[PDB]
């Protein structure tokens with residue numbers, strides 16, 4: 001993934017647990033050689049997966065729990081680190097934002113030519129609910145989507161309940177989330 005993602009992981013861990021903890025995690029991920037992540041540079045997905053695993057071991061938390069926290073953090077991180085206007089242009093409510101998400105990544109894909117973005121499709125069930133279809137070239141990131149949606153809920157001051165109903169992991173075609181939102 002692009003270095004931006006790795007910078008954000010490093011940033012989250014450093015802020016919450018300090019530099020020493022970050023250094024340990026980086027060491028254990030086998031990335032001692034890397035002095036810093038370059039934001040607009042493409043890295044092997046392995047770099048990100050090794051960071052998550054090492055963080056899980058060092059911090060004593062399941063990787064999935066960390067993915068949730070990271071998904072939430074990313075919504076704030078992007079708005080403060082160069083993407084605030086891009087986010088604002090994707091709308092002012094949870095449902096409109098999720099509708100624009102493919103188009104937002106298309107725009108992101110202008111500047112990050114090698115992007116492999118997720119694909120998100122919305123089926124609205126009411127004015128307070130939707131089924132969200134999540135398709136990816138990558139495994140294991142559904143928990144991050146859950147945290148992202150909560151991050152978006154906080155962004156729009158909107159209560160959200162997210163329950164995963166299909167798992168690309170129990171053999172379903174792709175992840176599907178049922179979402180309830182009020183405000």
Ligand code: HEM
Pocket residue numbers: 001002004005075078079083084086087105108112114115116117118119135136137138141144145148149
């Ligand atoms: C301005 C805001 C954002 C920017 C600049 C951005 C950029 C990126 C980048 C660089 C990646 C790495 C993909 C790669 O390197 O191939 C990514 C992946 C991803 N993004 Fe976005 N993103 C933004 C907002 C969001 C939001 C609000 C969501 C909410 C769902 C989201 C969902 C995801 C997911 C789930 C992935 C995992 C990639 C995958 O599934 O394969 N992003 N994004």
Ligand SMILES: [Xe]
Pocket residue numbers: 005074
């Ligand atoms: Xe991300």
Ligand SMILES: [Xe]
Pocket residue numbers: 005048070144
């Ligand atoms: Xe990630």
Ligand SMILES: [Xe]
Pocket residue numbers: 009052055066067070
């Ligand atoms: Xe993480």
